[PDB]
Amino acid sequence: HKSEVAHRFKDLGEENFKALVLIAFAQYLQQCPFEDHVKLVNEVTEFAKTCVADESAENCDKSLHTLFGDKLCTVATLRETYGEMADCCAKQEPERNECFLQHKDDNPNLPRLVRPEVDVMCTAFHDNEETFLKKYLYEIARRHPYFYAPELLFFAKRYKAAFTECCQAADKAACLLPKLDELRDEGKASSAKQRLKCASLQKFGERAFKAWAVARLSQRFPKAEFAEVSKLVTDLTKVHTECCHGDLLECADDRADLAKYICENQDSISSKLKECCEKPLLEKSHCIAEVENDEMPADLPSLAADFVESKDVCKNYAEAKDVFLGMFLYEYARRHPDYSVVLLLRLAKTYETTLEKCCAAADPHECYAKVFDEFKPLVEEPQNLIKQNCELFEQLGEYKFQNALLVRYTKKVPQVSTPTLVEVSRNLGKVGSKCCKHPEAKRMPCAEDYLSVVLNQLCVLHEKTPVSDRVTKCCTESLVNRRPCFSALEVDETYVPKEFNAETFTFHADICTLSEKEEQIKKQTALVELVKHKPKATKEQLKAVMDDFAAFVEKCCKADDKETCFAEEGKKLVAASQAALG
Ligand SMILES: [Y+3]
Ligand SMILES: [Y+3]
């Protein structure tokens, strides 16, 4: 209509409109208290009601960017609080929005999240459900300025459901706390993925993202014609570029436009969009993004015919290299949803390389004949790693598998800080228990998802604390070969053992009153420091000390005087270990 505010309000819903407006303003004004934002939201809401009533009231036909900016400049203490952001309020559209976007340093140290007792929150929730979820969004929004506001709304919907059920049950802490921790982990995991996707765009460029998207969309929509997948990738690239740039308004519009188009052509894209295209406008974008892979046509031509066996390959390559390479990805990706996107890019990379030499050669059809024998090792490598690692995950527990990784990676890079080694290994153990549950046809894509974000946190951690040139090489190299680089890491033979530190290997009765997580991390920290001090001790000898130490703790914890038991007999264990490890 004449006004956009009216449409959006009516196209979305008052309560959802009031939420997005709250997040939108909270992401910029990361200082102004909660009560201030509520006033900002109400003023905007009432204004939108005026726009809903009169389709041409005072400043009602203005664009969202314009209207948003005007209200953002209305704040009194703007240059007196945020600093350079106020110079943007002296500009005009569309440069003013571009300004605001620039001055958005997403690292303003804020008071750490203060989680009270389980009953005070439940009481506050019940008294005012609406405002309890409003304060949730505010506190999160200002802490994650680049977090996609709609995605934060699905995190608030789960937050309500958790509190709605767990505040009614007998043991509220044995329902809520675990559910709250899971969300907090899911939230940081979602955040990390967005910032990784964006960092990759600002490193390898649009063409690189396009290649990633083709491979992924072809896996999800293995029926959709190539011309359709290309058009979806072209829209996804523009959507991803405006979201990484920091424009929530254009990001949310382009996502809505794409969600609408996908839902209007589902018969020509996928049959698995039936229930996603049932939902409201805002949930369409989210549902479609996590949509299950469609079944692949059984009557598919052999992909080796049009790319190797054919004698028009070089001729069909010359016409449009990227189009032809895109078709190769499309055909390979849709035939192999059990492959990681990263593996398919290794194959797509290899094929390009081989066509860039063999097509300029004397006899091409002779040169690139055996190109599919070059993929076999590229495919077998990850498959062999998964099968070998998932087998070992069955043999031991989850915690016992983490101990195996602890030893494995400490021996490889013993210079890395214990906490980084513990955090990485524990996370990597949880990948095993969340992927090995599936069969071979789901494991690799499952692994890729989790490994991508686990390997990036390590790379970010190591960049703040540079320690190994090898780890720097792995983090700075091609994103495709990131995981292979870490896999290829050899045991450090140069490394000289850390000297024995009594403080490091002294435990008390205090450990008995630690949660399973706390206890495990204390024990796993001690294991890393054992390998850093005995890096050439065998899996045999480590297992011996670990078990001797495991039996040691589960022998005085809940025993007649546990304070002396863990000090007196604890010293004997150290001495008993110091006899077998020189
Ligand atoms: Y209530
Ligand atoms: Y734009």
UniProtKB/Swiss-Prot annotation:
Changing residue 61 to N: In Malmo-95/Dalakarlia. The modification N6-succinyllysine is found at residues 203, 434, 517, 562. The modification Phosphothreonine is found at residues 81, 418, 420. The record marks 197 as: Aspirin-acetylated lysine. Plasma. Residues 1-184, 185-377, 378-575 form the Albumin domain. Cu cation binds at residue 1. Changing residue 499 to K: In Manaus-1/Adana/Lambadi/Vancouver. PROSITE patterns: ALBUMIN_1, ALBUMIN_2. SUPFAM superfamilies: Serum albumin-like (SSF48552). Ca(2+) 1 binds at residues 4, 242, 247, 250. InterPro entries: ALB/AFP/VDB, Serum_albumin-like, Serum_albumin/AFP/Afamin, Serum_albumin_CS, Serum_albumin_N. (4Z,15Z)-bilirubin IXalpha binds at residue 238. The record marks 2, 18, 39, 62, 71, 91, 104, 134, 157, 172, 179, 188, 193, 203, 210, 238, 260, 272, 284, 357, 370, 387, 400, 412, 430, 434, 464, 473, 498, 517, 522, 536, 539, 555, 558, 562, 572 as: Not glycated. Disulfide bonds join 51-60, 73-89, 88-99, 122-167, 166-175, 198-244, 243-251, 263-277, 276-287, 314-359, 358-367, 390-436, 435-446, 459-475, 474-485, 512-557, 556-565. Belongs to the ALB/AFP/VDB family. Interacts with FCGRT; this interaction regulates ALB homeostasis. Interacts with TASOR. In plasma, occurs in a covalently-linked complex with chromophore-bound alpha-1-microglobulin with molar ratio 1:2 and 1:1; this interaction does not prevent fatty acid binding to ALB. It is linked to Hyperthyroxinemia, familial dysalbuminemic: A disorder characterized by abnormally elevated levels of total serum thyroxine (T4) in euthyroid patients. It is due to abnormal serum albumin that binds T4 with enhanced affinity. This is Albumin. The gene is ALB.
